[PDB]
Structure formats: C-alpha cells, structure tokens
Write a protein that binds this ligand. Structure first.
Ligand SMILES: Nc1ncnc2c1ncn2[C@@H]1O[C@H](COP(=O)(O)OP(=O)(O)OP(=O)(O)O)[C@@H](O)[C@H]1O
Ligand SMILES: Nc1ncnc2c1ncn2[C@@H]1O[C@H](COP(=O)(O)OP(=O)(O)OP(=O)(O)O)[C@@H](O)[C@H]1O
Ligand SMILES: [Mg+2]
Ligand SMILES: [Mg+2]
Lengths: 55, 55, 55, 55
C-alpha cells in the first residue's frame, strides 16, 4: 500500500479486514469479487425469545 | 495456530439490518485480542481521506 | 492452486488428499465463471474446514 | 534481439477481472529481467503526481 503522504509502501497483509453491507448487489462486481460473502440470516421467534430472555 | 505465524484475511457479511452485524465485531476483537477500530465510510467520497496528500 | 494453498495452510498431501474427480465435481457444480477467484475460495474453504476438523 | 538495441513499447491487456492481469506482470519483469515497478492510478485526480511542482 502506498500513501501519498508517506510514499514508502506499507505492507499490511496481517490485518484482518471485515466489511458489512446488508445487500450484496450495489457493490461493483470487480471489487465485490475480492471479498467472500457470508449470509447472516434472520432469527425464528422461538429462540429470539430465548436470546432476549438471556441478554 | 497450525501454521505458526499470524496471518490476516478480508471477508464480508450481509443480511437484514439490525441483525447484529456490527455488534459482533467488538467481541471478536476482544476474543482474538486484535485491536479494535471502526470507521463508518458510508456517503464519503474523498479518496484523499484514505490516501493523504502529496506532502 | 492446490500446492500453493496447501503450502499456505501448512496442510500436507496424504493428510488432505483431493481426488481429481472430486475437483471435477467442484468445478462442474459450484463455480462456473470466467475468473479463477471464486473457485479459489471454494478450494480454500475445502482446506480450512478439514484443517479445523483435524487440528 | 534481432535489431540489436533494446527498445520499448506500450501495451494493454483487458478482459474479465481476476483473469491474471496483475499477477502476470511481475513474472514478466522477472523474465526479461528489467526491474519491476507498479503504479495504481485508481481514482486519482491530481496532475502533480505525474508532474511535480515548480520548485
Ligand atoms: N445474535 C445477537 N446477539 C446479541 N445481540 C444481538 C444479536 N443480534 C442482534 N443483536 C442486537 O442488535 C443490536 C444492534 O445490532 P447490530 O448493530 O449488530 O445490528 P446490525 O445488523 O449491525 O444493524 P446495523 O448494521 O444496521 O447497525 C445490538 O444491541 C445487539 O444486542
Ligand atoms: N495464467 C495464469 N496462470 C496462473 N495463475 C493465474 C493465471 N491467471 C490468473 N491466475 C491466478 O489469478 C490470481 C490473481 O490474478 P490477477 O490478480 O492478475 O487477476 P486480475 O485480472 O488482476 O483481477 P483484477 O484485474 O480484477 O485484479 C493469482 O492467484 C493467479 O494464480
Ligand atoms: Mg451495524
Ligand atoms: Mg488485478
């Protein structure tokens, strides 16, 4: 990586990036390809109760 | 843990808003012990913000 | 791809063998696109689940 | 090699993303043995990067 201010390349491979978009369409495809998607899914009531009753 | 030295990866999530997509991050960073940091980007347009200037 | 990712994960041949017919299945079914990225993720996932399963 | 003196050109591959465009160049530089460099210009909007300043 090459910041304009400090031109010397900055390796940052060890970082653990994350990204959070709620719909996987708006992202332009070439960029969208880089990042594997993982679909979080909506809860069912029977255990939505039991989480809310715990936390 | 298997291949010794630490490594970093980039990945993403998507689902209905408010499902906990953002809550999990801080606990994760305290689990793995990496330092947390967040900065919402949405609606930004200035590339210089993420790349500095000519100095 | 296979030697590279296996070196990347530290797994070994004879610890995580993949028959070529299996690979033929994986490509015939799960990734059918011009790039060689999507398939890259499939075969990395294929390693990582086994890696956790063993380690 | 036929004409004697070395001489350069300009080239531009294009095709679907992830086909290998970025990973091949480095090997090419290692092949001809002329030294490598790299210069992303994604989204840049400042002429000074190509032209310096008036001193
Ligand atoms: N599985 C869960 N466990 C604990 N809390 C949850 C869970 N799912 C949702 N929540 C609650 O949802 C609230 C906000 O969650 P979060 O912000 O992660 O939703 P979100 O999908 O990030 O919403 P947005 O991305 O729009 O902020 C938190 O207060 C959190 O307690
Ligand atoms: N001809 C090839 N031989 C070996 N590996 C290849 C080849 N083409 C692509 N790859 C694989 O593609 C990966 C990276 O490809 P590369 O980044 O050049 O794709 P790309 O077209 O630059 O994508 P983008 O331009 O969207 O970044 C490497 O892991 C590489 O092994
Ligand atoms: Mg959130
Ligand atoms: Mg590229």
């Amino acid at each position: 990586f090459l910041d304009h201010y400090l031109d010397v390349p900055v390796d940052l491979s060890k970082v653990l990036f994350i990204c959070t978009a709620n719909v996987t369409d708006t992202i332009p495809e070439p960029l969208r390809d880089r990042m594997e998607m993982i679909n979080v899914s909506g809860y069912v009531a029977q255990e939505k109760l039991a989480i809310a009753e715990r936390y | 843990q298997l291949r010794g030295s630490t490594q970093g990866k980039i990945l993403c999530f998507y689902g209905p808003p408010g499902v906990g997509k953002t809550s999990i991050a801080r606990s994760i960073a305290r689990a793995l012990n990496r330092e947390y940091f967040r900065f919402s980007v949405g609606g930004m347009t200035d590339v210089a913000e993420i790349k500095g200037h000519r100095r | 791809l296979v030697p590279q990712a296996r070196a990347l994960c530290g797994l070994d041949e004879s610890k995580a063998k993949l028959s070529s017919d299996v690979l033929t299945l994986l490509i015939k079914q799960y990734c059918r696109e011009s790039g060689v990225r999507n398939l890259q993720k499939q075969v990395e996932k294929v390693l990582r689940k086994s890696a956790y399963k063993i380690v």
